[PDB]
């Protein structure tokens, strides 16, 4: 296992990743399209889901069956860090699905999540994603530990 694996999801995750490219192979990014992919990302892992080119209910059934495939690209590690926005459609779905998988690995990890504040859509998503993490904490019987950063 590596010391730490860093996982980023959705646009916000992609954007934060650009600041951590010096960590290279330890960084793993996921999104549903390439709107946020920039040149510096060549230095890290980037995986885009298939058939997915803001609505979480729409994105979920498309990405769910692909999660096992995403997880195979994430090495076993002694610790993980997960990072995404609570308020969009892709990060707030990929992030928690991967988080659920990390719980199944009996992993130690923390997340960095952003409270998006632009619109009632963002705010509704923030609520549903926090509730998602709570449901996961209960279902997997594990604390889901997050550093919460409001915009």
């Amino acid at each position: 296992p590596v010391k730490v694996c860093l996982i980023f999801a959705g646009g916000t995750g992609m954007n934060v990743a650009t600041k951590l490219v010096d960590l290279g192979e330890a960084v793993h990014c996921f999104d549903t399209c390439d709107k946020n992919v920039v040149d510096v990302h060549r230095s890290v892992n980037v995986t885009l889901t298939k058939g997915t080119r803001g609505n979480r209910k729409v994105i979920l059934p498309l990405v769910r069956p692909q999660i096992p495939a995403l997880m195979d690209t994430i090495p076993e590690a002694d610790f993980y860090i997960v990072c995404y926005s609570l308020g969009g459609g892709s990060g707030s779905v990929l992030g928690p699905l991967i988080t659920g998988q990390l719980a199944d690995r009996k992993a130690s990890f923390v997340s960095f999540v952003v409270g998006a504040m632009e619109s009632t859509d963002n705010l509704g998503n923030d609520i549903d994603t926090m509730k998602t993490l709570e449901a996961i904490a209960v279902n997997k019987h594990l604390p889901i530990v997050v550093n919460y950063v409001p915009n």
């Binding site: 399209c33 709107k35 803001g54 859509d121 963002n122």
Partner: protein
């Protein structure tokens, strides 16, 4: 608008169309095809809203965009990402970052704001304007017929 050439109006429309062509060119950071779809088809995910005729306002300043009344759905493009400000009270809001090497980038920031509480007035102005014009032309009073029941008129209206 009275006094303005169709040439002038057409030029303005073409320049606005180009901004929309730019908007949807899929080359902006952070901006998805799905982001655009959910901006303009806002009732798809906001089911409590009423589908109806809405106006699109295309503005090149924050100030002008903020002055769109009762904004529903907003998309902002910025060339300088330092200038991004989450202004207004729309229900849906998204931002894209334009590229300085994008030759189609005509302005430093462009805001595409959709509302619907503006169409009313527009229609009123047209109805009121037409009414006034019709009133001036309506208030007419034709003269009495130049032919009396005395003239012998045949089926083709021939009087011989």
């Amino acid at each position: 608008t009275q006094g303005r050439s169709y040439e002038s109006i057409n030029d303005e429309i073409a320049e606005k169309i180009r901004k929309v062509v730019l908007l949807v060119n899929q080359n902006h950071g952070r901006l998805d095809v799905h982001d655009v779809a959910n901006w303009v088809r806002f009732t798809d995910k906001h089911n409590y809203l009423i589908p109806q005729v809405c106006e699109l306002h295309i503005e090149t300043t924050r100030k002008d965009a903020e002055n769109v009344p009762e904004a529903i759905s907003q998309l902002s493009l910025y060339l300088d990402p330092s200038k991004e400000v989450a202004f207004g009270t729309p229900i849906y809001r998204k931002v894209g970052i334009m590229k300085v090497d994008d030759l189609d980038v005509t302005d430093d920031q462009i805001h595409f704001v959709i509302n619907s509480v503006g169409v009313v007035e527009i229609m009123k102005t047209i109805t009121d304007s037409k009414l006034e014009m019709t009133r001036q032309q309506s208030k007419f009073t034709q003269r009495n017929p130049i032919i009396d029941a005395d003239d012998n008129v045949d089926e083709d209206g021939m009087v011989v």
